[PDB]
Amino acid sequence: MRSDKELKFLVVADFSTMRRIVRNLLKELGFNNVEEAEDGVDALNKLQAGGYGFVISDWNMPNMDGLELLKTIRADGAMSALPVLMVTAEAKKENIIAAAQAGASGYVVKPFTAATLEEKLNKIFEKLGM
């Protein structure tokens, strides 16, 4: 429905190209309420204003990385409920375990196709009920 398509996303990544790819895939899926941030600090400044419903973060970023962003989110009372999808690089399963242990709603490995992202997004929406 139009209503659920209203879910507000925050895409967090140092690389503009990455933010562009994700933002287009979201648009292909019908989600137009998308915002961007370039590091963990910029993201927290936007999240604290509230009213966000889903966060997608890349892993390596300056100032505050993705893992650190995730722990910060999970430790904040008002934010601990946010669904958070972590993007990680291949050859780094340690990153996958780390994200699971920190409370990531899910992870997606890059590069990823339009199909994979949707696949992971849908799995998350079932678990939390959306």
UniProtKB/Swiss-Prot annotation:
Binds 1 Mg(2+) ion per subunit. Phosphorylated by CheA or acetylated by acetyl-CoA synthetase, depending on which acetate metabolism pathway is available. The major acetylation site seems to be Lys-93. Dephosphorylated (inactivated) by CheZ. It is found in: Cytoplasm. One of its GO terms (molecular function) is phosphorelay response regulator activity. Changing K93R: No effect on chemotaxis. Its main location: cytoplasm. InterPro entries: CheY-like_superfamily, Sig_transdc_resp-reg_receiver, ST_Response_Regulator. Changing I96 to A/V: Enhanced CW flagellar rotational signaling activity. Involved in the transmission of sensory signals from the chemoreceptors to the flagellar motors. In its active (phosphorylated or acetylated) form, CheY exhibits enhanced binding to a switch component, FliM, at the flagellar motor which induces a change from counterclockwise to clockwise flagellar rotation. Overexpression of CheY in association with MotA and MotB improves motility of a ycgR disruption, suggesting there is an interaction (direct or indirect) between the c-di-GMP-binding flagellar brake protein and the flagellar stator. This is Chemotaxis protein CheY. It comes from Escherichia coli (strain K12). The lineage of its organism: Bacteria, Pseudomonadati, Pseudomonadota, Gammaproteobacteria, Enterobacterales. The gene is cheY.
